[PDB]
């Protein structure tokens with residue numbers, strides 16, 4: 560089983576290639592990492608396995624879900640350290656995903672009820688709804704388009720949050736540049752209607768993700784930085800006229816960051832739409848992997864069978880699993896043994912109970 564051949568991710572000697580994908584679960588009450596997160600990540604930690612945390616706030620204005628953890632306060636750093644310590648005691652590697660939602664927010668999640676920020680003033684359309692703190696769904700509002708100075712301020716929020724993650728003991732961070740959130744709002748030409756140096760050409764639309772990655776690389780070292788993108792996923796009205804071209808343009812920038820800095824990133828992590836994985840039971844994921852000089856993590860609809868094939872065929876070095884890892888704490892062992900998998904319950908994906916639907920999925 561090629562998922563269980565060892566893989567060297569930079570300095571980390573991973574014992575297998577099954578990765579916990581980052582997933583928002585909304586158990587970090589009032590944005591403080593809770594003891595429940597410690598139990599949840601400990602359940603899923605394995606010796607030599609790689610874990611990526613749920614998306615984590617980089618600033619008071621970066622959230623678009625309730626009770627998502629932050630890492631922009633020293634208090635949050637203190638609580639994360641206890642979670643990281645428990646995961647490390649099980650021999651796992653863990654990166655903190657740094658997440659700014661951009662226009663995918665709501666007055667209820669913003670300080671003083673202010674407008675969410677974005678590359679544009681266009682809102683997400685009404686065919687997407689936002690989860691509210693009381694469990695209902697609301698309307699995405701009009702965002703405020705930020706200028707170049709404020710862009711540099713958001714870049715500094717990523718930098719400070721990366722330093723805080725290292726202070727908490729994380730082995731690295733992952734830049735969330737996918738799924739229609741703030742970075743993707745600069746990448747995707749269906750969203751980026753700017754006419755300044757951050758809009759228009761592929762080079763200009765890639766400016767923001769390049770500045771973010773460069774800032775964190777210069778703060779904590781390239782080896783501790785992973786980057787996640789999703790050029791073909793249209794979540795939250797985030798469409799590009801040429802996803803392959805946009806994806807290659809991003810890979811181009813990452814390769815050059817690595818050349819200039821003198822060190823490779825931890826990895827590039829790409830999610831594909833779930834319908835692509837269903838058809839495999841496309842060439843986009845392989846094309847990005849072939850173009851990127853370093854470690855490649857594939858994600859999006861993967862199964863045990865599709866994961867094995869991805870690694871065997873050379874389509875990826877690592878395979879991250881989301882929904883199956885929610886309901887299977889010991890997903891790694893179930894995949895090793897080809898054991899049955901627990902069904903996952905979508906109703907408790909984003910609820911606040913520290914146990915129900917979170918840590919009470921049973922082991923084999």
Ligand SMILES: Cc1cc2nc3c(=O)[nH]c(=O)nc-3n(C[C@H](O)[C@H](O)[C@H](O)COP(=O)(O)O)c2cc1C
Nearest residue numbers: 580581582583614830858859860861880881882908
């Ligand atoms: C409930 C839920 C929360 C998620 N939260 C995040 C997130 O915070 N950051 C991120 O990059 N992706 C997030 N994702 C997407 C997953 O990381 C991953 O790409 C996806 O679940 C992989 O497909 P799979 O569920 O078929 O394995 C989330 C997905 C789900 C279902």
